[PDB]
Amino acid sequence: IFSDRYKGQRVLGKGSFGEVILCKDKITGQECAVKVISKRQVKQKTDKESLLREVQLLKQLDHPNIMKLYEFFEDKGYFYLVGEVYTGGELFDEIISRKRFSEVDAARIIRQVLSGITYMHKNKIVHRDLKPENLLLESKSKDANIRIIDFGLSTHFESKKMKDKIGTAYYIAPEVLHGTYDEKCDVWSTGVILYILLSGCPPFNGANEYDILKKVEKGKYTFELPQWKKVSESAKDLIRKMLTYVPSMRISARDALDHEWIQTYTK
Template sequence: MDGSGRAEMFLRNYKLGKTLGIGASGKVKIAEHTLTGHKVAIKILNRSKIKNMESEEKVVREIKILKLLMHPHIIRLYEVIETPSDIYVVTEYVKNGELFDYIVEKGRLHEDEARSIFQQIISGVEYCHRNMVVHRDLKPENVLLDAKHNVKIVDFGLSNIIRDGHFLKTSCGSPNYVAPEVISGNLYAGPEVDVWSCGVIVYACLCGTLPFDDENIPNLFNKIKGEIYTLPSHLSPGARDFIRRLLVADPMKRITIPEIRMHPWFQAHLPRYIAVPPPDSMQQLNKTDEDILTKVIKMGFDRDGLVESLRNRVQNEGTVAYYLLLDNKFRKSNSYFGAEFQKHVEGYNCINENETAASAVAQRPAGYVNYQGANMRSQVERKWALGLQSRAHPREIITEVLKALHELKVCWKKIGHYNMKCRWDPSQHERTTINNGMRSLYFGDESTIIDADNTCSQPNVVKFEVQLYKTREEKYLLDLQRVNGPQFLFMELCVAFLAQLRVF
């Protein structure tokens, strides 16, 4: 049986149409879903080709992440059909192609159009971060436009999951769009590198060129790390200020997504449904559209079974039909899968911000840490906060931290500008305390630092990481994360550390 025959045998619920594109690992075809009549795109990936290209991990990662995400500006994954020879990935059909081609066609976009596209990109990227996903390869080629020029973010093959207390180090992405800390080989939390890439995208939309471009890669990287770019004279003052705040080489000083939302240039003509942070996936799973549910039940599906499958994210014929009908219903309004998510939003400056902030906290999934800080700058200050917050300059904070570690006889190893691995041996602390004034062997001399990765055999040794990151404008958060060792000893160390910093 030839390839077409194989595909039709396994894709009984679809009528295959023309080929939209052919790549090294397979092809993409347009198809019609027979139960609903809606168009989809089907990526046909050949297992042998994927294996030969060593891209199995990328494919698995993209599928896993797309199954987590449900957002109007992120490509929708409807189902995955696996066979011994091929993988069929059924996604939303996006008609108008890449943002890159659209920019090339128009030369550069009018400021209002560029802003509208950027607002949608930020809405999708923020949703990813809220659901602990960082894209890591944002660029105009990975932003598609539908028939109404609405954004669909695609290609999550280089994405990764954000985990509490863990930082990424993989250098990936396209050279022209990659953040300085990534090309420098530094550790990064994740969201900040997506913000940099968004800055390059908005520059490309407004200017029709890339801010950083050079045929020589070392020269290109020097321009990126040195923030060497020019702003054309046709840009408005607001756009110029916005770009300058996005393309900041130091990730600690770079604007965050909550700050992007507050910027006057971004707020202009802001659609109602983007004016508040999107609901997370868990909230969406608990919502069902009764009209769509009724239509799918009429197709012959059991109501209880369908509702259970939707809540547990089970992929079957009923759930595929449900989401195809749902997406078609709300495609015109661009809402977050239901009018209930936008009916209270009459304008960004008229929102009940306290209620919105409280709702956002309640909707967060278990294990969620907001690396980007508060969702809205004007939300009510919380009584409790994670870690230590300071308004001092990052260098001053790190200096004080190192002094405190030195006094406590903590061994440390720098693994980033604002990140270090630490090791505390209480017995070492006791021995050095006897010799009053003795300088720690490990402080300030990286050549003599004991690598914390190789010192976990002693039962009473505590290993932990210290990380400083930005939470909001002029404010930084210091986080201590235990890696291993006795929990109570770690707590004892934290108390002593706070005392050294004169927190209490």
């Protein structure tokens, strides 16, 4: 059980499928993060054994750009996912706070996000709901790494979130809206993130969730806004390759990570 391994402290905040709380290991004293997925408000999309089968694989997975999952617990009331706690906060909050944000800076971010997606794709894990909220900074350090949270949770878990409805609509893939989605959906979301890091504006706009989803669904976007004239043609080529409507025709995370822009604008 959870009580035999970790002791609960303060509430760090609310996540996707439950509340996050700071917990300490009862033997090593290491501070961890626990996601309390309430069985009453969250439904199980998969069979009890297939959830544990994936969790077992997730525990073995280690990469510098993905949140490390330590252990999983389950009772008659909740579900407990214990992992590495990150102190740097939301990546976008750090970007906004900066004095200057160049193409080199955005490539450093997207190169890190793609490496992370490439690893989970090689290990048959999908995100589906990838957005800025799911991009955390490891620590408050100067050269701190980006960590992707909530990977694989969408596959096994599914409630109402009106205050977070418009937030998810900007980054969602058209196939996900159709119903038939695969791993390609994460490349589209990274495309939206890349588009916003370069221009500051979402490629699919609207005053409400429906208006945003309709634009997402039609799949048409432009490089018409004045901020796109400063942006290199190589970056635009990558966004074009990433926001390809047909998922079959859409380029993979491995090939997206292997682009002229990613290579030249990093190391």
